[PDB]
Design a protein around this ligand. Structure first.
Ligand SMILES: Nc1ncnc2c1ncn2[C@@H]1O[C@H](COP(=O)(O)OP(=O)(O)O)[C@@H](O)[C@H]1O
Ligand SMILES: Nc1ncnc2c1ncn2[C@@H]1O[C@H](COP(=O)(O)OP(=O)(O)O)[C@@H](O)[C@H]1O
Ligand SMILES: Nc1ncnc2c1ncn2[C@@H]1O[C@H](COP(=O)(O)OP(=O)(O)O)[C@@H](O)[C@H]1O
Ligand SMILES: Nc1ncnc2c1ncn2[C@@H]1O[C@H](COP(=O)(O)OP(=O)(O)O)[C@@H](O)[C@H]1O
Ligand SMILES: Nc1ncnc2c1ncn2[C@@H]1O[C@H](COP(=O)(O)OP(=O)(O)O)[C@@H](O)[C@H]1O
Ligand SMILES: [Mg+2]
Ligand SMILES: [Mg+2]
Ligand SMILES: [Mg+2]
Ligand SMILES: [Mg+2]
Ligand SMILES: [Mg+2]
Lengths: 371, 371, 371, 371, 371
């Protein structure tokens, strides 16, 4: 009876039972299709590889995320990911457990409504609820007032909350996330002389982004130090044994997250995003929001992102307020942990919109906006 | 058996037992309502914040004084303040102690009568009495003849008294008080370039009025000195660390209390108010009223208001009479102290109109006009 | 010798000679800066695009209004707009004609004073005057008593006037204007699934606001009708040929102007703004102000705003007084027409503060407060 | 003093003086080495044949392009091509004229920097500049806004430009070009039964690609017509008198340029390449880029490539925008003509980085990114 | 009902029933014609000797392989080999069993189509299929991912396969095979002084190639050791008792297979062939192809060809990947064994194109490209 907490994130799908501490199913939301063979059912190799099988057969597939910046945009491959999780990764009938789902804020209502329609009509979910990822990360942080800055690979949204009482009029969202960081690493590794153009090469560049790239404090001084051949240069073994010496491109990929004009995404920086979310909030809230700024999402796992977020809000904020950038471990999993917290909550048990209630009112039930 | 002395003032509610020297419950009469969330009982955050809790959650609330210039005008939030005091601030059953209540003079009789009705029928008060604030401040001043000039944030009323023998035909009341001073500080800080429009910003402006504003002697000479950048300029830290340099707006807010045409309240100045209350009194009373003019209420806590009241009555009075402007400390609390004096008085124990007497005669009992 | 009437409005700058009927220069107050190229003077493309040139190059620029809610806040780009008008749009030496300027009421005095300083010291204006926009719109309405309700894209201020005799103590100002309507249309088109985040997309959303949005009578009944797919849905061609079907978002953008809590601007509605400006005025003035309420500014060009202003003041006013909501054509240009009227007036020729008088008294001359 | 414009293209090297209309030196960038004899200096036949001499001795040589997809990858044979041009083809001392050089965009910086090092240190160039081929082709097209789609035998890069103001964040590059078309013609002539495996046979296949292959409109209908023995079949005389009847292989070689999955180059088609370069650009730029799409490079000389580019962007673009595929004559030479235009420009005379300036700053001068 | 598996190889024709382990008919594909007598039917000696009879009468015949590098090029003698097999070697009616046929990849389609036409119209085959030899050798190797390097006497083709999913865009073929090795042994035995010019002498040279020639590790060091008269010299008895001492010509015949420039076949070496077939494949496939490289065909029966293939791919591959050159026994027969595996497969029973289906669709059926 432990309800399912499926973090339906952009990059990877995290899923597991409520009341746990780590998801069982941790695998990327990738559906792979072959590119140099026939789809004959007769010999019948397969047709589609989902997640870790797609990661194994990464070479002969056309890997494509079905979702697009939170918008699902492709229902068939998404549904393939759904039943693949439910019947191969967690191995439970979907009518046995309720399904608590996650999303990015400010989504088009057709996405939430048709996702509810598929969960209720294809899988016959007993009951469900769709929650914002940032409120879940705040509940997993163990506090009541903070700003949760999630940036999960398609989105980068900020949400301020003050002792509960969620503020819908200062939630704001960007598009600069880890996908653009991967594409910028493609555009910047062309300077070294290494061709990266395919989806397998895309996943290799994404792996180099995860394991190799750090973030500096002063970008200009670090560019000054990246003139002599110093310790900023580093090698990396490719899966065919090839070695790439990555020099100044270590720190100049997370520089996009604080200078979005380097890829031409005309928007504010993430520090300016959070500071303007503070400025949209009124006074007497700011003192409790300058001191509990909380990072979340997997793209806050850069080494030194907290001290880059410090000295930069500090330049924007007045210099008499405590700038307490809080970045815990398991920032990848904070949304799932908060979903497991709310799914275990007895007070939350009023919020499970049942399929019976879906047949009672109709598909317009999913925008009642309660907690 | 010590009866309750509840100063039901406009700005803050002062309450405490009789025979004390300071009220236990000192908190503003503010009921706050949320403005960016739902009022769902299920999660059930709260619904209303009263006084100091509203002062803590000042940012996310719509703060609103229920009372209006002495007229209560909103019975539900006022009743919320009543039981919040009686069960959270003083922590006593209201049938255990009698309740001595305060009011501004010349109120509409429905306010006093329905307040008596709520104290007798909702709370089951054993006995009560409603007294004028100025007579209480005179009894706390320790004299028998004087003019008490109370101005408590919605009202500014003057009462002359001569050795007892309260004069109902020279009591006169205005509306110019600290609320209009706060709104004038909003209108005058727009010249500096600081937006103040919300109720949280209203309370911040009220705090600046309390802690920063003094009152001059000659307003024209002080405007003459407020042309060079001199010591009249002063800074102030806001709760988000913002700094406002307040220059000539220090002294030009209490200038409204002696020039009410600056906000368009077409009435007499407070000095002209008191002088005309003297002129409404007959001769052989004036000599004992020019020498015992007593300030009271929290809006007489401006630095130098006594010497501004001097030289100004002196210009109105003939120059052969002692103009003795008396302004003690605890002018905020003088009404409560006089209420504690009368509530301790054995002679006053005839005046406690009981709920039994309320059932004896009816709701018209509250206008017998005795001492 | 025809003096310049420059409507220095928030959205667009209207300017022309006195004694005319329409401004020659009608172009938005926008200074554009490039975002994907170098500012090398050698090839020297340009550096800044002003107004209609910025509107032409809307795609490759960072369009930014220099002004901010009446406050100019950026003197260099504003000065660029000034000399661009004077030397490209009207083509006259600024010392040849006097310059009558417009502003929103309750501005910080540094804005008016430094604007006068730039007009007198950079351009060498012969003489000038700064007038409130609402008094100009009343003079262009051809009446002597009314309430002018201007809402020009950064401000929304109301001014009551009774047979001349301007009342400074009932003029009141808000911040809810067309800029917030554009940002709310961004926040509400995210529900349809159309990304609008850049300044070019901002101007496209502003164009859709001008050409597509109407205003309802009963918002709740119109939301009731916006459940079936009815004629409230409508398409719009984007400059790349894209088509957006706008349904209930037609009428729910001007709903912000009568429900400012939908964006969290905690203030009164525009109807409550005007009604409270009436209540700040005394009786015997109200009968001549309930019958001559005059709309002005470009954001009163919504279809049906007069009948929305009716039935809503009528619910606030007593039901025995004529509620005559007057909304002429050319409400965009009414401030400029009234400026052309006063600039043609021989009686007004005492009010032209010359640069010689600026050197006579000093920069404190601009607050003498005469008509 | 007419500076050298050397189109350093992949296939052939075009070079000539500035201010002309056609290059003097038009010969392929091929260095040939013997394969059935000794390299004895004693008799001393030769050692290497460059370009047209290699084309004459095509049979007994191992013909090899030194460059590789824009990357030079072989400095000695490239330097042989350089001095062979400068001393046999144009016959001028390289210190007499400045050398304007061309390249494909997104090259590894070592290629540009060491090419500058060789031009400055081996040849002692007086001054130089390296320009993108697409900007040169746009300047030779005589317009200011367009998308130049160059595909010169190793690369196929698209560049959007809007009234100057070069956009570095929508330039994107592929590898599918004429080299892969030649290798696909080898792989597809094996079906006819004609062995092509050597570099002489490679050049013969390249000549058949130039002179024989057209491009269809509907590939499926043209495959339908290529079932009956129709006029799509055609003969060709080889240099030994052999005759090959080429049937459906006429049109199915440029089909690779619009179906890159036929050789397994997992990327977008050239139409999808240009359409995604449009989509990377923002709106208000697209209308001026759907109407001025410009082809360039020698591999746009297929018969009917303009009408194949039409009806295919039209299926991708919305059907309300003018799709004006512009394909001039001399698309081979457009880069050289634009180089002759900029090399004649007096405004461009600031951009000639001298060898003196190379000794001033150092070899890092070649990435200042100015026009 | 066991279907025929006829390895239609270049050198010898292997044929036998499915489900066996060795072919019954193992004889060379040679048709012999007399050269010193008349073809009179009257006495009627014979006219043509096929295979082993031609091998017996090797002296008085003009032995000629009908096939040419996979291309059959002579239909009458090939048809003689077909019915000679079917009626003298296996002794079964061809309509009794289906016939699974083998071929080299990239053949001209007329060869496959007319071979199908002869099998269906002359012999009346019930059903058939034509498979690539390398896929058969991989299925006989018992793995799913590898590179099969077949070199059967006319061809030398490499095919990479990854868990099924056959890659048509990295299959590549040469012409250097055992025929050229035999002709090079003719050209190199002229140095010893032994005339070999006839087809009988050709078969004797081929027998010496099979039984006498090994392959070295370092060719230069083995040439260094082939200066003193050492154990590299060896004798051989000819069928007339003649003895040839073969010295350095032992190892210098398979040196052609790794140095194809010694006969002037301008192509890559077999190690460079396989390495470039790896490079044509993408990454994440290479690790499973560097470790399962599989030799096949009879010309991989040289002593030490595995250790020559090692240290040579190892010099080309990076030195951090396992180079596992796998060379089983029965590399001659691996194609036939894999054909017997697929001909026994029940899943493969969809692939038997019947003569009925040949009359259904037509002769274009043989290019449907399924497994
Ligand atoms: N060590 C790391 N450093 C920087 N980024 C990381 C690291 N590990 C993971 N990431 C980023 O986190 C992403 C996956 O986490 P997350 O954003 O939570 O997925 P989702 O998109 O589902 O929210 C990866 O795409 C990667 O970009
Ligand atoms: N130091 C001060 N200077 C000027 N005014 C003050 C000061 N302290 C308090 N006040 C005024 O006193 C008010 C509260 O006191 P009081 O008038 O007694 O409340 P009530 O309205 O209940 O009578 C505040 O609203 C403030 O305007
Ligand atoms: N047809 C229309 N319907 C609604 N609003 C309009 C219309 N036309 C113009 N507007 C509004 O009027 C504004 C420009 O007029 P105005 O407010 O006079 O400019 P300013 O800010 O200079 O006063 C635009 O920003 C737009 O928001
Ligand atoms: N008539 C033609 N039809 C198709 N392609 C052609 C034709 N003429 C030339 N080409 C192609 O143009 C190439 C040479 O031109 P170009 O691409 O400008 O050289 P570069 O590689 O130097 O840019 C040749 O390799 C050939 O592939
Ligand atoms: N012991 C051996 N050493 C080297 N090569 C051999 C040996 N035995 C056979 N061969 C080669 O194998 C060839 C026959 O095998 P194979 O290539 O399978 O025939 P096919 O051409 O039908 O594929 C002979 O022509 C010979 O060149
Ligand atoms: Mg995630
Ligand atoms: Mg009080
Ligand atoms: Mg305007
Ligand atoms: Mg070229
Ligand atoms: Mg064989």
């Amino acid at each position: 009876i432990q309800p399912l907490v499926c973090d339906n994130g952009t990059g990877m799908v995290k899923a597991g039972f409520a009341g746990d501490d780590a998801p069982r199913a941790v695998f990327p939301s990738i559906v792979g299709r072959p590119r140099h063979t026939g789809v004959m059912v007769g010999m019948g190799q397969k047709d589609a590889y989902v997640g870790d099988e797609a990661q194994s057969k990464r070479g002969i597939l056309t890997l494509k995320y079905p979702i697009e910046h939170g918008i699902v945009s492709n229902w068939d491959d998404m549904e393939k990911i759904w039943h693949h999780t439910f019947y191969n990764e967690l191995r439970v009938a979907p009518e046995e457990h309720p399904v608590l789902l996650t999303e990015a804020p400010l989504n088009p209502k057709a996405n939430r409504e048709k996702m509810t329609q598929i969960m209720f009509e294809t899988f016959n979910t007993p009951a469900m609820y769709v929650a914002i990822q940032a409120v879940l990360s705040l509940y997993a942080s163990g506090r009541t007032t903070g700003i949760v800055l999630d940036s999960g690979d398609g989105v980068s949204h900020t949400v301020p909350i003050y002792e509960g009482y969620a503020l819908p009029h200062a939630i704001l969202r960007l598009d600069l996330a880890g996908r653009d960081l991967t594409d910028y690493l493609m555009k910047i590794l062309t300077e070294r002389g290494y061709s990266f153009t395919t989806t397998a090469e895309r996943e290799i560049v994404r792996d180099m982004k995860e394991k190799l790239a750090y973030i500096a404090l002063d970008y200009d001084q670090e560019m000054e130090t990246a003139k002599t051949s110093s310790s900023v240069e580093k090698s990396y073994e490719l899966p065919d044994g090839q070695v790439i010496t990555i020099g100044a491109e270590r720190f100049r990929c997370p520089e996009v997250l604080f200078q979005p004009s380097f890829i031409g995404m005309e928007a504010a920086g993430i520090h300016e995003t959070t500071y303007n979310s503070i400025m949209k909030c009124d006074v007497d809230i700011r003192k409790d929001l300058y001191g509990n700024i909380v990072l979340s999402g997997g793209t806050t796992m850069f080494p030194g992102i907290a001290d880059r977020m410090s000295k930069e809000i500090t330049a924007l904020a007045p210099s008499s307020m405590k700038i307490k950038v809080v970045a815990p471990p398991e920032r990848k999993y904070s949304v799932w942990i908060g979903g497991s917290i709310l799914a275990s909550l007895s007070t939350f048990q009023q919020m499970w919109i049942a399929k019976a209630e879906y047949d009672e009112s109709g598909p317009s039930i999913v925008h009642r906006k309660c907690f």
